[PDB]
């Protein structure tokens, strides 16, 4: 009990959720509909 207590306390002390919620907002950053854009003229103008 005390060895997986002292694994629990370890596991929370890197605070992996934080790490993936600063992940989850840096994506979001990024400008996906630029890129949407650029791929729907590329695939009209092979259409074309």
């Not at 370890?10 to 840096?26: G, P, W």
Request: hydrophobic share 45%.
């Amino acid at each position: 009990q005390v060895l997986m207590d002292k694994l629990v306390e370890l596991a929370h002390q890197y605070k992996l959720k934080e790490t993936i919620q600063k992940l989850s907002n840096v994506l979001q950053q990024v400008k996906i509909k630029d890129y949407f854009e650029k791929l729907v003229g590329f695939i009209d103008d092979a259409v074309k």
